[PDB]
Amino acid sequence: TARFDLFVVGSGFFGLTIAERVATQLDKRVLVLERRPHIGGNAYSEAEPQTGIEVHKYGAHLFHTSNKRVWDYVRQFTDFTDYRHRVFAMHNGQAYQFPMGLGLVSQFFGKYFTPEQARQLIAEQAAEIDTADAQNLEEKAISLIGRPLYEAFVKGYTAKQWQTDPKELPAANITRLPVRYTFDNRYFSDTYEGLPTDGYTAWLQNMAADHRIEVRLNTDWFDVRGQLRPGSPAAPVVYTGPLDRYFDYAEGRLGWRTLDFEVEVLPIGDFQGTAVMNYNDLDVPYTRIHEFRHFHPERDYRTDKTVIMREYSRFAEDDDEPYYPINTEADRALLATYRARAKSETASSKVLFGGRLGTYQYLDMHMAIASALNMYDNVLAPHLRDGVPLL
Amino acid sequence: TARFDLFVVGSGFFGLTIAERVATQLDKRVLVLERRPHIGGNAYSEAEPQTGIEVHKYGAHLFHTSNKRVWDYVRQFTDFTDYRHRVFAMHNGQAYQFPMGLGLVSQFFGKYFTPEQARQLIAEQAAEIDTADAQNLEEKAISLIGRPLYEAFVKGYTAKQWQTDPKELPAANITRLPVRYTFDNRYFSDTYEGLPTDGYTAWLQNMAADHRIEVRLNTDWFDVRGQLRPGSPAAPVVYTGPLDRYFDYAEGRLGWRTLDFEVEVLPIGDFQGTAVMNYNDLDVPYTRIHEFRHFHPERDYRTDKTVIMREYSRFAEDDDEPYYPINTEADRALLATYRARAKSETASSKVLFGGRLGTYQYLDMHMAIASALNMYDNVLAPHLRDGVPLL
Ligand SMILES: Cc1cc2nc3c(=O)[nH]c(=O)nc-3n(C[C@H](O)[C@H](O)[C@H](O)COP(=O)(O)OP(=O)(O)OC[C@H]3O[C@@H](n4cnc5c(N)ncnc54)[C@H](O)[C@@H]3O)c2cc1C
Ligand SMILES: Cc1cc2nc3c(=O)[nH]c(=O)nc-3n(C[C@H](O)[C@H](O)[C@H](O)COP(=O)(O)OP(=O)(O)OC[C@H]3O[C@@H](n4cnc5c(N)ncnc54)[C@H](O)[C@@H]3O)c2cc1C
Ligand SMILES: O=c1ccn([C@@H]2O[C@H](COP(=O)(O)OP(=O)(O)O[C@H]3O[C@H](CO)[C@H](O)C(F)(F)C3(F)F)[C@@H](O)[C@H]2O)c(=O)[nH]1
Ligand SMILES: O=c1ccn([C@@H]2O[C@H](COP(=O)(O)OP(=O)(O)O[C@H]3O[C@H](CO)[C@H](O)C(F)(F)C3(F)F)[C@@H](O)[C@H]2O)c(=O)[nH]1
């Protein structure tokens, strides 16, 4: 007589992966509850009416992974193009090859450097701190790319994105970018990469297309959990919303970063001649500019119009939507207290916590999907199928 | 009682395509005669013993095509990697993004140019001649990329490759390179591109693997045609050797360009950090340098050794192997006389002429394969199957 076998809070890639796996592999009924008027979370996309160009409404999303299982899993719901993401950096009125590589070095220092000459120069300029003993973002970056490059391509950019002292930011944030001594300027270094052939929304709709999956939009979990859970007493709950918001900020508010976007349809065919242009200087407010027509070069759009998007970073207010965890020393101490409360909620009320917002972690699409598969394999499936305790 | 149904002179991509199609689609026996001690022509490759790195013995060969039929045809004999060829240009001790694009323009002129600002600058600097009215290479290049770029990236390079006045060289030679106003630096602009997964030699061996195809190496056609053709009187002949050499240079010698190579195994892991580096300046003898480890970035070779190859251009002597047709006005006049003789040989002795050497034409791998398929479909197959006259 139980209506649902599982509750899922959030229709992001983590939530949809969980819902899809439980519904199709266990033949169970899943209710997905979404606060927003649309599914997919921040991966939600829409076609711009004038051009037909797919616009990433919540910031550019580029898919990439070296996990074969994840790669094989996502291909069940969408095809991928042969797109290879590349980023250019604007500094002092000049566009630079990016990231760290022979192109960047040769441009910034005025002459060509062999792979060995480049390693030497950097080694010299990284002498202050070694890579292994780097506590924070600043120590890590300087140890990897040297100081003169750090000031001209990291200092200003980091200040605009976090508004937090780099000595207080995690070192893992900078290791997201590949450190290279070749002319290769692929922004990612994963085995598999590409954009959804028919868009992200179509991809996300396929994952929730199963008839055993019900998605209720414009619905807040905390407004309806009092009535739904009695309808299905034994049904566990997978929560992917903000971790601190779940406990009503009892111990305090975790530091988040949010983003403002500026979408504009220009009466020209090409604005910058590339997909993403980073702006490292402080004389400009936005961190970077996206031109979505270059996301799909295999497609042919009108050559008299183009759609660009400028990106702005600031602290996430109470009514803002959290995009990036800050993870300072104070933030991590607060996180540990919420992790304890979360661990108690699992034992007391069968509530699991996952996703970027649910765990306060810097998660990409492929990392959240992989994390969702792990939670399913090791936690959810043994419980829903064999009755194994959730923790 | 006829031993062979077809004679093929040359085991290049043109010759092997012809042989493979006739043998498998018509169930006919084909004799392939090769002057060299190996098959594949200039596409022949070998693994360097110290590293295991595939070396293109007769110059770097990059496959690319927009022809779906050709693409589907070649995949029957080999797989292709996701390799995308890119070339960098060395000038005045600095490495430049190549070819014509926003990267090159921004580097050479000292500041960033928008796609519109770039079109303006070039337009100004191309004012002398318009693209449509370009008679030769020099007029075509200047009309496309402007003069200051022409002198710094085309003048010196063209002088080293052809040693012929650019006003006397074909305009089609420069249109091989994509003219761009974006940051895209893909050297080719075809739909399909990649390198043979298991090497070129394995690819070529598969095309001639059929039991109805016999390949005789170290055999010159003109030494054995007197005895072979009586053995198979009705068998046509597909000749892919030098057109003028076939008629013993009766009307004169066509102008060809040959190449000398300098292969070296260096005691370092990386020489230039990219596959191909062009040298546009005259203060260096070689036209470009290839580093073959970057041809296959999906592979992992030893990091203490690397194999490079320097390329030198000069006029093809009598004992040299012709690589590039010069095609001056005098050359084309001589070609017209050989085309008439060739047309007579087809009527009198059933001898077809194809390939880069057989037609004195600037042919790529995909263009020769496509040309071979056309000759098969429209000429050879109707003759060998229905008895239709060859011309
Ligand atoms: C600006 C930005 C850029 C990114 N770029 C990339 C990229 O380039 N490549 C890449 O691989 N990844 C990228 N990511 C990461 C990726 O978008 C997400 O991690 C991904 O969607 C994974 O799912 P998630 O569960 O963390 O969903 P999230 O989208 O982080 O959000 C999950 C959902 O929970 C819902 N929710 C929250 N609270 C409630 C509630 N109370 N009731 C109901 N629903 C609720 C929200 O509506 C939200 O839709 C980016 C993320 C951001 C923010
Ligand atoms: C230096 C160079 C670089 C190239 N790079 C590329 C590239 O990057 N991408 C691309 O798509 N294409 C490239 N090509 C083109 C390509 O290599 C050839 O066009 C291709 O092999 C097509 O076949 P072909 O018949 O023209 O054979 P070719 O190799 O031009 O030669 C055909 C064969 O005829 C044989 N032969 C000649 N005379 C006799 C005789 N009397 N008896 C017996 N045999 C004879 C020769 O041994 C030779 O092997 C390049 C060519 C050269 C020369
Ligand atoms: O020019 C730069 C670029 C980055 N950084 C530092 O690296 C950190 C992370 O860089 P990222 O590019 O990974 O930042 P993200 O916003 O998470 O990455 C998004 O932006 C990219 C746009 O090309 C991609 O869309 C993406 F995949 F990496 C992203 F979507 F997640 C930054 O926070 C900053 O501190 C710099 O310091 N300077
Ligand atoms: O820097 C340059 C480069 C090219 N050129 C002009 O374009 C003409 C053709 O350029 P190409 O690159 O097509 O010359 P090719 O030798 O036929 O091309 C070979 O070299 C390339 C190496 O990256 C590729 O391997 C290839 F495919 F294009 C090639 F094998 F055929 C040149 O003859 C020259 O006049 C220049 O003037 N300057």
From Swiss-Prot, chains A, B:
Subunit and interaction comment: Homotetramer.
Organism from which the protein derives: Mycobacterium tuberculosis (strain ATCC 25618 / H37Rv)
Assigned keywords, A-Z: Cell wall biogenesis/degradation, FAD, Flavoprotein, Isomerase
Protein name listed in UniProt: UDP-galactopyranose mutase
Annotated pathway: Cell wall biogenesis; cell wall polysaccharide biosynthesis
EC number: 5.4.99.9
GO cellular component: cytosol; peptidoglycan-based cell wall; plasma membrane
PANTHER family named among the record's database cross-references: UDP-GALACTOPYRANOSE MUTASE
